[PDB]
Amino acid sequence: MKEFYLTVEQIGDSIFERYIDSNGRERTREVEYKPSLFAHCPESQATKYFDIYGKPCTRKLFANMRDASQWIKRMEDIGLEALGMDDFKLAYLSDTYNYEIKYDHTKIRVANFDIEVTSPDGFPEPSQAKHPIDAITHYDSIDDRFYVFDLLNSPYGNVEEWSIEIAAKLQEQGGDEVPSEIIDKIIYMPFDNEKELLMEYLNFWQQKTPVILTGWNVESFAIPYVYNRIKNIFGESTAKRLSPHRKTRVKVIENSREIITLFGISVLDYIDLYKKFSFTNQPSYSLDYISEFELNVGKLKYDGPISKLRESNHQRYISYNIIAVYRVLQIDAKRQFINLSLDMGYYAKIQIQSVFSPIKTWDAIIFNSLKEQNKVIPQGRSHPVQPYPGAFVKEPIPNRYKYVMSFDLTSFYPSIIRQVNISPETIAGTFKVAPLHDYINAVAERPSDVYSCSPNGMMYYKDRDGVVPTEITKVFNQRKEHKGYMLAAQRNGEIIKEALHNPNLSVDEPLDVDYRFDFSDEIKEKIKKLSAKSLNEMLFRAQRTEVAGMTAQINRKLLINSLYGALGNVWFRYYDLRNATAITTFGQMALQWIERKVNEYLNEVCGTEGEAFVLYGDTDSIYVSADKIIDKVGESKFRDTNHWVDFLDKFARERMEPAIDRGFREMCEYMNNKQHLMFMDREAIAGPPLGSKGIGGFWTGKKRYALNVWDMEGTRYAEPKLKIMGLETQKSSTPKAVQKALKECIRRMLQEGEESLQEYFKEFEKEFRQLNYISIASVSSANNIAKYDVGGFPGPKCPFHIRGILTYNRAIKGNIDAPQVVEGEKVYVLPLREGNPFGDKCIAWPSGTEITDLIKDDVLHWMDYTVLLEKTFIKPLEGFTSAAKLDYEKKASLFDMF
DNA sequence: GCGGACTGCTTACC
Ligand SMILES: Cc1cn([C@H]2C[C@H](O)[C@@H](COP(=O)(O)OP(=O)(O)OP(=O)(O)O)O2)c(=O)[nH]c1=O
Ligand SMILES: [Ca+2]
Ligand SMILES: [Ca+2]
Ligand SMILES: [Ca+2]
Ligand SMILES: [Ca+2]
Ligand code: NA
Numbered sequence A: 001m002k003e004f005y006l007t008v009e010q011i012g013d014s015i016f017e018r019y020i021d022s023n024g025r026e027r028t029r030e031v032e033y034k035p036s037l038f039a040h041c042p043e044s045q046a047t048k049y050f051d052i053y054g055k056p057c058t059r060k061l062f063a064n065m066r067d068a069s070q071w072i073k074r075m076e077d078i079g080l081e082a083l084g085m086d087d088f089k090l091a092y093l094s095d096t097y098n099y100e101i102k103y104d105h106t107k108i109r110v111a112n113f114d115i116e117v118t119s120p121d122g123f124p125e126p127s128q129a130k131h132p133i134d135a136i137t138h139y140d141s142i143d144d145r146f147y148v149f150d151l152l153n154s155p156y157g158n159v160e161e162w163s164i165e166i167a168a169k170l171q172e173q174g175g176d177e178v179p180s181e182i183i184d185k186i187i188y189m190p191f192d193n194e195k196e197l198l199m200e201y202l203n204f205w206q207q208k209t210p211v212i213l214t215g216w217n218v219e220s221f222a223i224p225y226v227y228n229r230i231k232n233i234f235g236e237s238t239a240k241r242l243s244p245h246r247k248t249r250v251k252v253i254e255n256s257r258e259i260i261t262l263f264g265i266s267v268l269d270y271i272d273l274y275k276k277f278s279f280t281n282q283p284s285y286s287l288d289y290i291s292e293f294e295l296n297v298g299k300l301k302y303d304g305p306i307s308k309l310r311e312s313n314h315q316r317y318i319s320y321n322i323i324a325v326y327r328v329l330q331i332d333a334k335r336q337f338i339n340l341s342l343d344m345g346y347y348a349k350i351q352i353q354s355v356f357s358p359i360k361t362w363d364a365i366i367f368n369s370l371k372e373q374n375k376v377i378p379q380g381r382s383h384p385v386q387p388y389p390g391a392f393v394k395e396p397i398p399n400r401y402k403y404v405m406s407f408d409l410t411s412f413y414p415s416i417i418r419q420v421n422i423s424p425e426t427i428a429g430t431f432k433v434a435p436l437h438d439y440i441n442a443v444a445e446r447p448s449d450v451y452s453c454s455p456n457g458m459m460y461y462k463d464r465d466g467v468v469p470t471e472i473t474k475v476f477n478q479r480k481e482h483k484g485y486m487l488a489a490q491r492n493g494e495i496i497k498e499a500l501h502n503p504n505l506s507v508d509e510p511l512d513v514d515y516r517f518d519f520s521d522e523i524k525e526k527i528k529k530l531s532a533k534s535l536n537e538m539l540f541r542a543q544r545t546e547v548a549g550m551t552a553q554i555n556r557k558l559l560i561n562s563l564y565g566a567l568g569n570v571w572f573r574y575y576d577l578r579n580a581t582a583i584t585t586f587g588q589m590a591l592q593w594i595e596r597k598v599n600e601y602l603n604e605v606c607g608t609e610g611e612a613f614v615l616y617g618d619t620d621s622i623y624v625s626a627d628k629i630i631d632k633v634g635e636s637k638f639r640d641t642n643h644w645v646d647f648l649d650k651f652a653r654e655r656m657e658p659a660i661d662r663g664f665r666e667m668c669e670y671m672n673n674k675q676h677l678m679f680m681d682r683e684a685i686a687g688p689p690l691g692s693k694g695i696g697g698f699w700t701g702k703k704r705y706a707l708n709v710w711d712m713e714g715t716r717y718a719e720p721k722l723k724i725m726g727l728e729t730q731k732s733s734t735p736k737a738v739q740k741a742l743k744e745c746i747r748r749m750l751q752e753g754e755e756s757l758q759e760y761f762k763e764f765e766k767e768f769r770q771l772n773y774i775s776i777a778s779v780s781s782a783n784n785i786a787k788y789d790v791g792g793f794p795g796p797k798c799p800f801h802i803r804g805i806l807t808y809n810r811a812i813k814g815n816i817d818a819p820q821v822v823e824g825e826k827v828y829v830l831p832l833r834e835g836n837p838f839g840d841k842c843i844a845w846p847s848g849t850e851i852t853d854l855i856k857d858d859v860l861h862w863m864d865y866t867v868l869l870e871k872t873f874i875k876p877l878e879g880f881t882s883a884a885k886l887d888y889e890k891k892a893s894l895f896d897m898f
Numbered sequence B: 001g002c003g004g005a006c007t008g009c010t011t012a013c014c
């Protein structure tokens, strides 16, 4: 096989690389890398090298990397540009791997681990590490084994060995329900004392040194705790064995919090992977909560606090430590963020951990692309941060909207980049701008008949290829492929859902199909004959495939959109507000241009005149009212709900889309762009069920609407799905039960109507006081707690949730056992009635947890249900109904005298 | 006494 790197580091004049060789063996080498940088030279001394603007450069080879650095500093002192890749690691990877890297993940050692630390006095600070490590579970992807390190003897209690027999048993059997599929993959190692455990763990670590290191909060807890605990017990030199090059870096962030860097290892903390790539916003980030959300597994049941879990039930303590490791593996098998990281990493030729940084990622991609053409990249420059305009958002009339059909541009900003040919080296010049609306209304003169233009005043060469359009097109093409797999899996999913209404009472097996492709006619008919067991199992697999495709597509979308963003970031080598603004301004034009076009077409083709068909739009979308399209054919002429959905689908596809294409082709001609790429397709088709009292949809304002959608991008739902954006149902700050309740209110408004809504509202108001307190607690981030802490009491302008935390701190004052609220973390928040013993109107505690038993029963007693109802439920519901022209409570009439 | 304007904060949409 072809060679591929694992990790790379720069240590002085040395580059330490771990890699897989031709034969597939993991090796390590120290290369005294000789880097090259470039300086502008006279036109005479022209060679192979030119900068992106075509200026000739002399290559300077350095004896070592330190000489290259000092030369950059000297060029600064003189005042001349020092060109080339300054991050020498990237240059090394580029030199050593001058080809598209095809890697084998089975050769990459991916380590998942989690530790346990019993602490009698609050959270065990990793910087201190004054408490014994009493459990480590370490999964090795190559061995496919769970290595368990268990401490039997500790100053916090002596315990017996862990039983794998009991761990495997059901919880109903008094066991721990450790999943059977990993029982045989467990390698158990008990220890007499901590020193021998840690000594053995280090030797294990040397034999099986992680390349990718992951787990849950491993960077902020596990890694620094293990490092410091070993450093304290054995000395710093022994602690440095955690690095395969024996080099570590301790980053001090008192704010005492330390972030350790282990050279030769790529740490991909899964909580960080999750926060960046999952596109969720969770009210809690405990592994327990996340596992429940992602995998639908039950909460880990146990008695007493974790601080005493080891002494009381050491059996369950160890089993839970093993399960915690497996949970992350399971989440990754679904989400596949590690696979995504490896893909991006080797594509860009960076350190794998640099996937968290789109700027670093694109810097390397662009550098490699330019390097292949013997071109030289510019030097990074210092820039002041400046604001600049972005997208346009139409102000909608707050109202209900019965029939709605939406359209959206494909990969807007990247497409604009490719269309206009926007790139640092393709700038042709400028022109005098007319106001933006003159271009929208096709009144302003054509900017240029020679160059490609944006309404911000920028002109670009139509002939030359740009490194930014070139490299962004490559990633986009990948994105398009993976979205295709996703949508097909989604379409296949609905097919199975429909067949779940007629499940055959039979014993069979789930069909063997690649869910990434639309089911063949053969497969469809077989599905209509399978059992509920086989169908449900297929549905599960169809959704797993869809999720996998989602991860692959939405994050390539994130990457390319981040390239656009990078153009407006001062730390990006190719920062340029001319280009950034060229994109956004063009976008503002493009959206409002097509609004005018669609309005003109519809008005004509619908017979009317001057009517507003487009009711809303954000950045690159339009929401077209389709009432008069349905009315032009008459509502009675439709068989069922599905019939008119088929009609609008055909109408949007056969008539609207070609018209929209013509409008954008003209705009492309107007701007004299390089290539027409403004592709606006139909997205949603919304409306009430046929012959019902539902309103279909409504808008309360910008970025706040709800639609009863029957079809989305070609996927025809078996049951109508509510597309709700911006409303309280979509916010993590809204209490769980309230989200659920508000959504059903919305569902009833859109699908059933006013009477159904009032019916449900009356019931919810009557019974909501029985809801669990967690389900009705609000959630908020806890930032700058100390900023508003004045003697344990709320200082001036203290935020409501911060007040709740201060209330909590006073309530738990005097107990180190009580859970502390962590700065930056999220908290549950509850209002308190006026005569409460806490001395304030609200209280807040760490989210994802049951509030401490110290004050729990008192909180439950003094909860303000009246305030909770009106503030979190009624007030938002009033907003929904006012806009939609509805009442949630039956109004008083003159008939009330009867 | 409290509403409206403005501010900080939070978390959406794109
Ligand atoms: C979601 C998102 C969008 N945007 C900008 C750039 C996008 O082109 C524009 C519209 O975003 P979207 O319309 O939401 O998505 P997209 O057009 O980029 O690609 P697609 O619709 O086919 O899934 O908004 C960002 O800059 N950052 C983001 O995170
Ligand atoms: Ca011993
Ligand atoms: Ca779009
Ligand atoms: Ca689309
Ligand atoms: Ca089309
Ligand atoms: Na743990």
Ligand code: NA
Pocket: A171
């Ligand atoms: Na069970």
Ligand code: NA
Pocket: A127, A228, A231, A232
């Ligand atoms: Na120490």
Ligand code: NA
Pocket: A499, A502, A503, A504, A527, A528, A529, A530
């Ligand atoms: Na059937």
Ligand code: NA
Pocket: A607
């Ligand atoms: Na007419």
Ligand code: NA
Pocket: A408, A683
């Ligand atoms: Na979309």
